[PDB]
């Protein structure tokens, strides 16, 4: 649903360290970060806000995305590091990047999805490719 | 803040002394307040291994209040306080709570360096630390 | 560390010696010294029961004891007491003690300068309280 | 020692006038009763039935107790009551008993209740050491 971002995240994790200092809230292992309906999955995450801006931050192989959209769309996905901007409402997943959906899947080096706009995007290096698909 | 080189005032039913030893306690109703900083508990027991002290506080639970520069204050609570002069250091251990305006963290574990302004949370392996999250 | 085992300085307006006691009594701007410690008070009163006992009054009274370590102790009470037999101190007011460091204030303080080990404490209703400044 | 107060009371001195009731004695003076002796420069009697009066600078005043430690003094005066037993030092006074010291300006004494008094008058005050 939109403004899913206007809710209380809910982090479970192992270790977390903060500074006050402007924001730097920094959790690792077995980390489960879940907003609304999101659900997030990563070895460490950062999250800073500079007295404002808040931007959650994936990192570890793999680590795992998914969301559920206003239409009941499952939307699920992957990379090397998640990227929600609370801002905007932007997402960058990067590198071995893979989104899905419940049609167009997306597999490539860096994937924007923005949940606002409805739209989603896909880069590739020099030498590498990119990916989708069709429901049957 | 400047709550670090404050005068310490600690108010409770009983005060007990050891100059050679140098193992002030603490019982009843404890509330020891140094600036804006507020620990309740039913034991304190500050102590000084040379000349270097260290407040301990003791509850079920023990509790924690400061006033931060930006004018939202700190509660927490634990089963124990250990609050280091030295280091301006305070860990609160067992059943862990801090408590800011927007965020709240529980784990085991509550390291809190208060001159630098940097927390830490841990957890026994097996269990895990929780976060929420505002606005 | 050696304040007891000297002569007893007192200077009173009047006093009493019960010689069968002793009940040695004092009054009117009682100033007991003896070594460093300076009771001051507005009755005083010596005995032995049956190892002699100091029993200030007046409301405040006051003590001093440099220990043997440059410790400069202090307080006050309305009911002051001292055994020299065991080196015991009993701050009794409006009671408030004192010392370089750290203040204490209550109902009841008592003492063992003997070994330094203190304590202090307070009716149900009333409450002790200790600063300690660097 | 308990028991002087009824001993006799030798007077004796260099020089003396009985009258009709107050006598006079004089010259290196000493009143002795039991233990107690007081030695002075010129004791007079009176009736408030007797009262015992002592002059000298000083005049100095011994006491034997029961349990062996000696009663010293020296006063101006030196008021004696048999009246009712009692006793005044006067003037730069001063009650040796160690182990007390007791030394004021008027020091009183009931020897049969084994008690003490001290005075001074606003100027200068009393002091008592305890050994």
Redesign the interface.
């Given at each position: 649903v939109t403004g899913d971002t206007?809710q209380?995240?809910?982090?479970?994790?192992?270790?977390?360290?903060?500074?006050?200092?402007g924001n730097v809230?920094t959790?690792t292992g077995?980390v489960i970060v879940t907003q609304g309906t999101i659900k997030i999955n990563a070895d460490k995450v950062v999250v800073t806000r500079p007295g404002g801006k808040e931007v959650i931050d994936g990192y570890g192989k793999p680590a795992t995305f998914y969301q559920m959209q206003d239409n009941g769309k499952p939307v699920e996905g992957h990379a090397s590091q998640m990227h929600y901007e609370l801002a905007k409402d932007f997402v960058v997943l990067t590198g071995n990047a893979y989104l899905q959906q419940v049609d167009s899947n997306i597999k490539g080096d860096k994937i924007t999805y923005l949940v606002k706009e409805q739209k989603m995007q896909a880069f590739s290096d020099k030498g590498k490719r990119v990916t989708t698909v069709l429901v049957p």
């Open positions: 206007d209380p995240i809910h982090i479970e994790s192992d270790q977390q360290s903060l500074d006050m200092q809230v959790f077995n």
